Structure 1
Amino acid sequence: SYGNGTVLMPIVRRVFIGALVGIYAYAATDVVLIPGYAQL
């Protein structure tokens, strides 16, 4: 917002949301899908 000094927490917000999307994608690939393809 205009007239405010908080400028570094928004960046961390976007980075964190990014990182969680990342982690969940990789976890689905690692723990579920790759084994599943051995059971498919």
Structure 2
Amino acid sequence: SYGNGTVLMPIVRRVFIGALVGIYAYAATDVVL
């Protein structure tokens, strides 16, 4: 938010989440679908 310089951790958060959604979606299509 306005007033602080914590500017990299919000980027790390969005990359980690996206990476998890892709790992567990690539495994289901191989086992289930």
The two structures have a TM-score, normalised by structure 2, of 0.82
Cα RMSD after superposing both structures: 1.9
C-alpha distance in 1 between matches for 2:2 and 2:12 = 19
Identity of aligned residues (%): 100
Report how far residue 28 of structure 1 moved: 0.7
TM-score, reference length from structure 1: 0.70
List structure 1 segments (4+ residues) > 3 angstroms apart after TM superposition: none
Residue 29 of structure 1: how far off its partner (Å): 1.4
Give unpaired runs (5+ residues) of structure 2. Answer: none
